Symmetry: C2
Subunit: 216 residues, 2 copies
């Protein structure tokens, strides 16, 4: 985590309990924006937003020297919020500033983010899987070539063993944590998933990003 401190762990609550996800600081005008999954910050089907959304950059068996960051605005895709549309299971959280210090300023790095890229690219996906065989404490990764959702939606799948808690973690184009972010961990099929699915980052994601990243 110390080497890619833009990636971090998410804690949040709903009426059903206390849960975890992952997220990533993306380059933004407000320097306060993390990319995550829609389902990590909103119920879907017209419901309420998650409560007490906290981001922990470079989490590693606990918060890092970078600390933990509360959300000020949760920015869900409209298709996710209204219909639980997994084709648009992406979102951005706009975090607090601490006495002038934005999360980007504290952590000192943020991922570029790209949209409307070809399908079928090679990805490195990251997150904090929390269900067995994982413990929720470690940054893990998956790597491989994306293929189409066999069930027929616009999502893409990569070979991956990560479990619940990894949702919202970044997909970077290419090998490693240094590429442009171009999707987010959305879902796998239990038990012992072997494919991670992530939504296509098209013009919906781009325009949601433009909006979130400017405050908003």
């Amino acid at each position: 985590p110390a080497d890619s401190p833009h990636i971090g762990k998410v804690f949040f609550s709903t009426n059903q309990g206390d849960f975890v996800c992952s997220a990533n600081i993306v380059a933004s005008a407000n320097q306060s924006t993390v990319a995550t999954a829609g389902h990590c910050l909103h119920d879907g089907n017209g419901g309420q937003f998650a409560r007490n959304f906290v981001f922990a950059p470079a989490y590693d068996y606990g918060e890092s020297e970078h600390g933990v960051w509360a959300a000020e605005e949760l920015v869900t895709s409209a298709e996710w919020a209204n219909r639980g549309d997994f084709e648009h299971d992406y979102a951005f959280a706009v975090l607090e500033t601490k006495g002038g210090t934005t999360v980007q300023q504290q952590v000192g790095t943020a991922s570029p983010i790209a949209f409307n890229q070809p399908r079928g690219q090679y990805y490195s996906a990251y997150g904090y899987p929390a269900a067995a065989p994982f413990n929720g404490q470690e940054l893990h990764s998956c790597h491989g070539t994306a293929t189409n959702d066999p069930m027929g939606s616009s999502t893409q799948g990569i070979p991956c063993n990560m479990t619940g808690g990894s949702s919202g973690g970044p997909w970077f184009l290419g090998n490693g944590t240094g590429g442009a972010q171009n999707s987010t961990n959305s879902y796998g099929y239990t038990f012992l998933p072997n494919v991670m699915f992530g939504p296509y980052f098209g013009s919906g994601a781009q325009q949601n990003y433009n909006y979130a990243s400017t405050t908003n």
Copy 2:
């Protein structure tokens, strides 16, 4: 109302019961977008989306020939949804398509929409006020020059006697229903009778519009 069928009445429900608002068809790529107030489609801080949001173009003691249109995507500003911030009490609803027909195609017209315009312009504001001495059945209007929020926020006020139900109704630059939409009826203050406040249509509103109008 027949002369300005892009303006219409809104019905919706929450856990607190059935409510009414106003809205306006604005030109959009998806041909399906109405401008309204954030509070006409989302509770604000800690709440959820309105249910059964329906738009009735050219309502006049009942639906017009254009019928009634259900929302598919409610698109609230982030600051309204997360904090009930009246500086951003604007929103867009993306409506259903009926047998291939979009609302903009049905009505055959839409208002232009403008952002980042000067403060203190002259407006014509419209809506379906539903509290006495109004009955919710009629299109009413207010006209005047905008002044600054006495509370010091970025909202603006105009002289206007319209009551609950008028929220979400359009403010058009200039005289009449034909100008560019540049705010929405949002709120009054208990101490200030007959003044309607509407949010500033700035870059937040523009980016929310860009996003909503492409479906989204």
